[PDB]
């Protein structure tokens, strides 16, 4: 499988002298770090959140990010003042693993406006024109440019390889779905609920014998709080037609033995 590693920063500025920056880190759909505004240190949410990095290497990366966080905050409030509140900024930075590609995207007020690409920061077509000046200034700083290039080209994929080794048990865990049926002139909506499965890929279908019911309407994948997934699939049926229907669930954890529940 091809994992996406993403570091997500969320910065809110309410006025001068109020902002917070909170970050979370995800490897695929498993959280590996949290870094709260009021916490000085990055918090591990897995045993293996350090990957293969040494205590010394990690400690200095933490300190580097600590200075980034303070620096970022001061620069945005300056940028705003040198030119309205409230301001929301989001950064999504990480790498997608095949080989791998890296990304660093920035959104302002909920909208994608800037990426780092190759060796420089670039505004995206349609971004506000006032960004051109500060981005040109940011691009004048070769230190940060080289530092970002190193983080994206080298450090990200390197770090993620270590995470995959160190987190193998959790990353490759199998948890079984448990399913149940419920239902809400004459027409009925049958609901097949499937909860507690991991990993995410799953197959759920209403069946009449070996015939798939094409009215099966799959909902979105919803998270449980215990790093498992929830999904439901509905079927609208006329009165009487309910007889003979089944919900069939296929999942990697089930060893080839599908769940079939009969309405």
């Amino acid at each position: 499988k091809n994992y996406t590693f993403r570091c997500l920063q969320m910065s809110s500025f309410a006025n001068r002298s109020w902002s917070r920056t909170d970050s979370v880190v995800w490897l695929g759909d498993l959280q590996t770090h949290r870094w709260s505004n009021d916490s000085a240190t990055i918090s591990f949410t897995k045993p293996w959140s350090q990957g293969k990095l040494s205590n010394q290497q990690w400690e200095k990366l933490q300190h580097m990010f600590q200075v980034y966080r303070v620096s970022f905050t001061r620069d945005i409030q300056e940028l705003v003042k040198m030119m309205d509140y409230p301001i929301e900024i989001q950064l999504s930075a990480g790498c997608e693993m095949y080989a791998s590609e890296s990304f660093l995207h920035v959104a302002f007020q909920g909208k994608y406006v800037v990426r780092f690409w190759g060796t420089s920061w670039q505004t995206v077509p349609g971004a506000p024109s006032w960004l051109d000046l500060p981005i040109k200034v940011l691009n004048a700083d070769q230190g940060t440019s080289a530092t970002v290039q190193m983080l994206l080209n080298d450090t990200c994929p390197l770090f993620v390889r270590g995470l995959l080794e160190a987190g193998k048990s959790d990353l490759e865990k199998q948890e079984k779905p448990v399913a149940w049926l419920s239902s809400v002139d004459g027409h009925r909506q049958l609901v097949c609920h499937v909860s507690g499965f991991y990993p995410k890929p799953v197959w759920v279908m209403w069946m009449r014998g070996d015939q798939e019911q094409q009215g099966t309407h799959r909902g979105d994948f919803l998270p449980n709080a215990d790093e498992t997934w929830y999904l439901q699939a509905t079927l609208d049926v006329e009165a009487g037609e309910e007889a003979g229907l089944a919900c069939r669930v296929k999942h990697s954890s089930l060893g080839g033995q599908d769940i079939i529940l009969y309405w």
Binding site: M64, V67, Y68, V70, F72, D75, D141, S145, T147
Partner: peptide, 16 residues
């Protein structure tokens, strides 16, 4: 300017 971040990246270039 982005003054502080530029000062950050200049100090933590040497570590990386």
């Amino acid at each position: 300017d982005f003054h502080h971040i530029r000062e950050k990246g200049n100090h933590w270039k040497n570590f990386l």
